[PDB]
Every structure is written in C-alpha cells, then in structure tokens.
C-alpha cells in the first residue's frame, strides 16, 4: 500500500485514492494525442532504452515454394525521458478538516495535471533536441503538399483530395486522420453568403477517422496521418504517478511524474500541408 | 584435404555459412 | 493443442492465441468483399474440388396437380487454390523478453495479413487464368450499360435509374449493392456551386444495401449486384492459418495460408457500368 | 547437460566435452589483452546496452554548512557487438572411425578459435567504427609523447623515465603496464653502457609489472597505462560458446560465438609513445 511505502505522511490510504482519481480525470479531458495512436504495454523499470527498426522506400500456387523475404532494418537506440511538476498543501486547514470530519480539498492537482499533458503534447508534435528524437513535423520523407486561399468556398476539398491521391499512389490505402490549426478550424466552420454550404459534411465522409484541433500548432498548418499499428506506436515505461517530497516548515510538498516515448516505423505514411508560401 | 586458399562481426546475425574447396586426395603408407 | 503439433518452437500455447488474434484483427479491417456475400460452411480437407450448376436464361386451385418442373443444370467442376505469405522473427530479443517477463511483440504479421487479403480481393474481382475460373467483370451475359459526364449535377441519378430499370425488366426485384471506383467516389461526394446539392442522399434511398469503394478497380468503372443466396456464394475449405517452417540459422520463420473459391449460379444478376467510350 | 539442448546432434556427450576443451585450449594461448585488464561479471542475456560515465578532469572550515557539491559525469550509452565463426564436418569419416574404434578428430575448430581471438584483440586495441567505440590509442586526452632513435646510446631508459614523469606530475601513480611492438622488444636486450647489465633489467624495476609484445601493433609504437579498477574495465555478456546448426544434406555444421565490450572512465591514465617518422 501507499501508506507503508510513504510514512510520515498526513494523508491516508483512502485519501491517496481520491487524489489519484482527480489526477487521472484531469489528465483525461486534456490528453488529445492518445485518441488516434495505440499504446505499447508497460515495460517496467528494467530498461531505460528501446530499439527502433526503420523501413524506408504473395504467391498463389498449388504447392508453396521455399523462398523468403527480408528488408533493411537500420536499428537505432532511443532513451526514455522524464517529465514532472509539483504543488504544495497548507496545514491548519487539513487539521480543521480532520477535526470536523469533512472531506479534504484537492483542487490544486488539476493545474499541474493539465500542464504536464500540454508538455507531453508539445514533445510528441515537435520532438526533443536534447535527446535528438525525431518529430512528426520534422521527420524525413514527409511528402509535403502546398495549399492556399481557403477563404472562398470549395478550395479546401480540392486540396484534401489532392493530398489523398498522393497518399494513395504510394500503396497506402487505409483510414486517415486529420489535425488542423484552430484558425483553419474556424474557416472550415464558416457561413458563406449566397451559397450557404456547411462544407464539412462532404469532408467528414472521406476522412472517416476524425478531424481534430490542437493548440500546439501556432500558424496555418495541418497533418494527415494513416492509422495503423505498423506505421507508428508509443511506448510508456511508467504512467502518471505521485510522490511525497518531504516535510519542509510545517507544510507538505508533492510531485507528479510520467515517462513516455514515440516510435515511427514507416516515414512515408505522414503527409503535411505546409503553410502558405506568402 | 588441400584448401589452397576472417571472422565476421554483426548485430542481428547471419543467414548463411561459408565453406572452402576440399580437393580430396589419397596416399599410401 | 498447437504446442504438441509443433514441437521445437520457442513460442508457447498462450503466445499462439495472441498471434492468432492479431492476424484475424488485421484481416478484418481490410476484408471488403465479405460484407455483401454470404459464406458456405467449412467443407474440410476431404475434397479439393466442387461442382457448380449454371442456370441461364405457382398454381392456385382447390386440389393440386401431379406435374413437376426442371431446368438445365450444366454441371461444371472447379478446383480449390491456395494463397500464402511468410515473415521472420529474430532472436536475442525473444530471449530478452523471456528474461524480463514483458510481453512479446508481433507487429510484423499484420503486413502479410493485409497483402493476403488484397490478393484475395483481386482474385474475386478479376478471376484466375491458371485455373480458368470466371470473374464478375468478365462473366458472360453481364447486361452492360454505358455512362458518361458525371461532372455536371444530376447526371448520375439518371444513369442509376436506367440501370435499375434494365435489372427490373428481367424479373429481378430485390436489394441492390453498388461498388464504385475511388475516382467516381470523389465525384459523387463533391460540392457543386450555385446548386449546393449533396447528391448522395437521393441515391442512398434506392440502393438500400450500400455503396462501397474498392481500390482494385483502376479506372472509371462500377458494378451493381443483386444480393441473394441463390445468385452467388463463396466456399471456403480452410480459413486463415499459421504454420512454423523450421529453424534456419538461429531465427524462426513462419507462414500464413488460406483457401477460398467463388460460385456464380445466375449470371443475369450482375450489371456493369462500362468505362466511357472516350 | 548436453544432448538436451541439441537432441539431433550426432556427437555424444564425451565427444562434445572434448570439442569444447579443444576449442578453449587454442584461445587460452592466443588471448593477450586480458592479462592486465579486469573483467565485469557475466550479465546474462537481459541487457543489450551499458552506460558509461567519463570524467574528463576542499571545504576546510569549522563545523557547519548546508549544501552539496557534485561534478559532471558526461553520461553515454553503448551497444554490445557479436562475433562468430563456423566449421563443418562429414559423415562417412565418422562412420569409419566408429567402425575401426579410432578416436574422432576435431582439428578444424582451432582455425576458428585463432581467428576470433585475433579479432577480439584488434577490437580491444583499435576499437570498432560502426558502433563508435573508442580504442586505447584513440581516446582524447591520451597524453602523447614522442620517441627517438633506440639503436645506440641506450636512450630507452631516458624515454621511459620521461614518460613516467608526466604521469607522476598528473598524480597518477602505482602499477604501470607497458606494451610495445616486437621490433622494439628485441632491441631492449642490448647491454647498458657503463653498467654492463641489460637495460630490460633496469626497466623492469620501474615498471613493476609484466612487459609483453603484441602482433596487433605494426609500426614502432608503444603504450604505457596505469593499472587499476575504476580507470578501465571489460564487460562480457557471453563467453566462448559452440552451437550446432540444423543439418543439411548428410553433413553437420557448427558455429562459435562470444560477446564483449570495453569501457574507459579516465582518459588521463594512459600514455602513447609515437615515432617521429610515423
């Protein structure tokens, strides 16, 4: 139990569960990337690094042959980073709660739970320079496309179908997911005079896996990603966890931490709509 | 047996072996 | 069990189930043709061939008569083909997984599971020349129709109703299913200026069994098929199965295989929209 | 233990023991680097990577102070390589020997043992390019020194004294080990002028450890290294081992393998003597 692991803690075993529920519920509503990407299983504390194999660039007969096929692995090694945030709890109110038997207040944790998720999203989208891990935007062989002038009606659909054709020509036919900037989201959901076309019902049919809005993307940009286990995956060593730092003064400081990493096996899947040249 | 003709280092391994020319001959005592 | 059948295999009985689940789940999302065609039961390993009878071209009274009716069978014989694909698993990582007690990775199988399904779809749509089995596109008496100029609004509905009338005149009244090329799919789901008509809500009412998109069809083409047990069926000798080839070097090679065949009893059901003459 | 790992191997337990003894005996003579370098204990198959800390290069007062001061470690990661070699046998000869009651011959394995030992020594001395593992003569801050003519006047003693002086100034003392090319090793037997003893006897007094020659060094060159743990170490994963591959035709193939890596913590414990012409 948590109580035996952490002595000298005013909080009890029941209160630890209530704290954990608040933390996970706060994280759930603000975790965006998890929706269209699967998860690797919890590896444990045994390893600090993982291996990634990059792949870049059937017969019908009565009796089978004896041949076999292989490709270029190009194995690489990646380390697992750590993220954290901390908060503090005052005394002289916890004592009052204990005396009056009323439940304790844990509103503070949500503020850190949101920020850690925001940092994780930024790391996934743009990558880390310290550990030189690649990101979706800066990955090699991303098959860029150019778009412009989304104001007038009917321009967005042509660009979408053009990107889909480029994805198809490389023998990648499957469900697609779309992520767009908040500014482009408003232009998509817009009222056009003399035409009165919603302009999203047509688009929703083809994509079939969802269009999402992310605040990390600052300017006008968008990504179209094929969804599959083979193309990409995400590996977690340990999930959200809470620890008790010590006893300074008379108050109690706490910390929350998490570890995660991303692996991209086939770079050709991703397509990026570059910002307008102007 | 007369061969009449180095170790390998790899990460994953190898799918093949290596051989040499036996050229067998017979002798009497 | 699989373990007794295949000795000298590092994988265990539990891992065999996990492999099978991954293979079947990968096949499920990419198997298209199964939706509008029923399945014959698993025959077994006893037979390698089937017989097909081709049919081409009630009385109300107080007491029944003694008459009977028959038709032309024209029995023919068809053999069952085989399809397969293979993959490899490295060592020195399986040992690490066993040592650390973490679960094993089986991502590779999905790549072959997709390709075998693609080959099966191609065989169903176009047929095989080696075994001279017919296909939907090249079957005799297919009641072709001609279409053109789908760009301007309102042309597609007229062609659809014309094809439906031809199907009806031959005493075939039932649910219909439609399969179209990806290019025609985009033209159907298009935004038309000054008219703002979705143009698919009207069509969806009549078809009543679904409009689908298949990547096998290269150019502009489409098929309308009546759905019924009598008209067509598909016979399976054995479903997706996995086997262990042997022990070369120090790694482990595996194979996946499947057998299937198609029978068309009444050729008149199918209607084909031929590509534009130009 | 044997005949359980390889049930299909024709060789019996006693023959396998003889084969293993013959394999190890050849390598025992050839191995030279392990004489003056320690070894990390076998780690098993769990780990494929290791972490090394490089150190490139107080507080006298009364009771008190509340602070901690640490120094940087420059953490880095490494990957363990694999080396292998193989040999083949025959069946008719084994049958003839069994019929005539003559002991079997295993001469071929000696060549493989010699070849793998000659590669392990070269990897230790010069390093591996693919994994970017530094060698003894390639580490930065190696404290080089330059030599002169050794044919006459007995300048070898002065060169050794000057080389030891730099380590003494840099505060590295204790046991030293000197490795030099055979050409320089031969010349040390010349008489020392005005003393009439051999200069090797004088040099041994300063060295206080074994002086050996290695064929890996080609030109006139030498290295003197301070010998102790926490300066350099060798980590082994698997020792020399022999495996029997799957039989093909009627013959039987075998292979040998081992895995080892090297780490250097303090680059300043080494000195390299360089010829001016080289």
């Amino acid at each position: 139990n948590k109580s035996q692991l952490y002595p000298d803690s005013p909080l009890t075993d029941q209160d630890f569960n209530q704290l954990d529920q608040t933390v996970i519920e706060a994280a759930r509503r603000q975790l965006v990337g998890r929706r269209f990407i699967e998860l690797y299983g919890p590896l444990g504390r045994g390893m600090q690094s993982v291996f990634n194999d990059i792949f870049m660039e059937a017969k019908m007969d009565f009796q089978g042959s004896f041949d076999t096929e292989v490709e270029s692995s190009r194995r690489v090694n990646y380390t697992i980073p750590m993220l954290y945030k901390d908060f503090v709890l005052y005394w002289r109110d916890l004592e009052q709660s204990k005396a009056l038997d009323i439940p304790i207040d844990f509103s503070v944790a949500a503020n850190a739970a949101r920020d850690v998720a925001f940092l994780e999203d930024q790391m996934i989208f743009h990558g880390s320079k310290e550990f030189d891990i690649p990101g979706l935007m800066n990955v090699k062989g991303r098959l860029t496309h150019l778009i412009g002038n989304w104001y007038e009606s009917g321009n967005a659909f042509q660009d979408i179908v053009e990107a889909r054709n480029k994805l198809l020509e490389m023998n990648h036919n499957g469900p697609y997911a779309l992520v767009l900037s908040p500014e482009l989201y408003s232009l998509l959901h817009r009222v056009h005079k003399d035409t009165n076309v919603l302009e999203i019902e047509h688009v929703r049919e083809l994509i079939t896996a969802g269009v999402f809005q992310s605040p990390v993307l600052k300017g006008k940009s968008g990504v179209i990603v094929n969804t599959g286990r083979n193309n990409l995956d995400l590996a977690i060593s340990e999930d959200f966890e809470t620890a008790y730092l010590g006893e300074e003064g008379m108050n109690h400081p706490f910390r929350v931490y998490e570890t995660v990493v991303l692996r991209i096996k086939r770079p050709a899947a991703i397509c990026t709509l570059i910002d307008p040249e102007e | 047996d007369i061969f009449m003709e180095g170790a390998k280092m790899d990460f994953q391994g190898s799918f093949d072996t290596e051989v040499e020319s036996s050229r067998r001959v017979n002798y009497t005592i």
Side-chain angles (χ1 to χ4, degrees), chain A residues 43 47 58-61 65 67 157 164 173 197 202 266:
Chain A
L43 307 177
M47 56 176 57
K59 216 281 160 295
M60 177 193 303
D61 51 5
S65 58
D67 50 69
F157 200 84
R164 202 173 69 97
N173 44 264
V197 285
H202 314 76
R266 307 177 189 272

Side-chain angles (χ1 to χ4, degrees), chain A residues 38 40-44 46-47 51 58-71 73 75 154 157 161 164 168 171-175 194-197 199 201-202 205-206 227-230 233 263 265-266:
Chain A
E38 286 81 8
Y40 208 1
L43 307 177
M47 56 176 57
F51 275 100
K59 216 281 160 295
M60 177 193 303
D61 51 5
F62 212 91
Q63 275 75 15
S65 58
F66 322 95
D67 50 69
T68 322
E69 176 76 327
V70 289
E71 288 82 3
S73 297
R75 316 193 73 175
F157 200 84
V161 76
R164 202 173 69 97
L168 279 175
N171 195 93
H172 279 99
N173 44 264
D194 78 77
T195 315
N196 53 88
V197 285
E199 211 181 15
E201 298 168 335
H202 314 76
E205 301 294 336
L206 304 182
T227 65
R229 171 64 67 91
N230 33 262
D233 50 349
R263 301 183 301 173
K265 270 173 270 297
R266 307 177 189 272

Side-chain angles (χ1 to χ4, degrees), chain A residues 14-277:
Chain A
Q14 282 284 350
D15 305 354
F16 273 102
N17 289 95
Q18 303 179 0
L19 180 62
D20 295 328
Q21 300 309 135
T22 300
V23 172
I24 186 56
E25 200 282 337
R28 190 267 304 178
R29 292 209 311 266
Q30 286 294 342
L31 247 184
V32 170
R34 299 291 190 85
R35 285 157 185 167
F36 58 90
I37 299 181
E38 286 81 8
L39 306 184
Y40 208 1
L43 307 177
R45 293 176 175 174
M47 56 176 57
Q48 302 167 293
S49 189
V50 296
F51 275 100
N52 174 267
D53 50 81
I54 303 181
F55 294 148
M56 189 155 50
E57 189 67 24
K59 216 281 160 295
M60 177 193 303
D61 51 5
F62 212 91
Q63 275 75 15
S65 58
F66 322 95
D67 50 69
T68 322
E69 176 76 327
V70 289
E71 288 82 3
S72 176
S73 297
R74 281 266 291 99
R75 316 193 73 175
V76 201
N77 208 336
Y78 289 150
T79 59
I80 299 181
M82 169 186 266
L83 317 92
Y84 65 89
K85 192 72 174 186
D86 51 354
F87 62 94
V88 71
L89 256 61
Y90 292 107
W91 85 295
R92 198 157 174 252
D93 55 71
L94 206 159
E95 310 292 334
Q96 176 183 2
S97 180
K98 281 188 173 300
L100 298 184
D101 205 3
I102 67 178
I104 323 186
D105 186 10
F106 288 143
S107 62
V108 189
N111 218 124
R114 191 268 303 275
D115 204 325
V116 56
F118 173 84
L119 187 56
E120 162 182 330
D121 253 4
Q122 183 170 1
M123 181 214 64
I124 281 187
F125 263 88
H126 281 78
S128 177
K129 248 59 226 62
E130 198 260 42
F131 301 92
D132 60 82
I133 50 185
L136 265 59
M137 301 299 294
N138 49 324
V139 77
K140 317 178 69 59
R142 61 182 76 89
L143 293 176
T144 71
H145 181 48
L146 272 66
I147 63 185
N149 194 22
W150 274 29
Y151 198 93
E152 293 180 6
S153 62
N155 299 332
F157 200 84
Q158 178 187 355
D159 302 331
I160 291 302
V161 76
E162 287 292 342
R164 202 173 69 97
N165 291 15
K166 301 183 181 307
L167 261 181
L168 279 175
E169 81 171 6
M170 284 297 305
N171 195 93
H172 279 99
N173 44 264
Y176 315 106
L178 174 61
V179 179
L180 292 175
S181 54
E183 204 286 330
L184 265 58
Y185 207 93
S186 62
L187 291 180
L188 259 185
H189 300 249
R190 190 180 174 268
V191 283
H192 309 273
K193 50 183 54 183
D194 78 77
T195 315
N196 53 88
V197 285
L198 186 52
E199 211 181 15
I200 197 189
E201 298 168 335
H202 314 76
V203 180
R204 204 189 306 104
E205 301 294 336
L206 304 182
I207 298 306
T208 211
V211 180
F212 296 104
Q213 166 193 201
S214 180
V216 180
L217 306 183
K218 303 301 297 299
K220 303 182 182 176
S221 62
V223 289
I224 304 180
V225 284
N226 192 286
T227 65
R229 171 64 67 91
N230 33 262
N231 289 3
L232 36 75
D233 50 349
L234 177 134
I236 42 168
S237 185
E238 189 174 8
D239 220 334
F240 286 84
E241 206 69 19
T242 65
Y244 176 60
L245 292 185
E247 239 291 341
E248 74 94 3
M250 295 185 176
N251 311 280
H252 322 278
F254 293 82
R255 181 204 292 257
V256 292
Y257 64 93
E258 184 209 39
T259 57
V260 76
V261 79
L262 176 75
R263 301 183 301 173
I264 313 180
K265 270 173 270 297
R266 307 177 189 272
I270 302 97
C271 180
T272 62
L273 313 176
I274 310 298
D275 328 65
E277 59 285 352

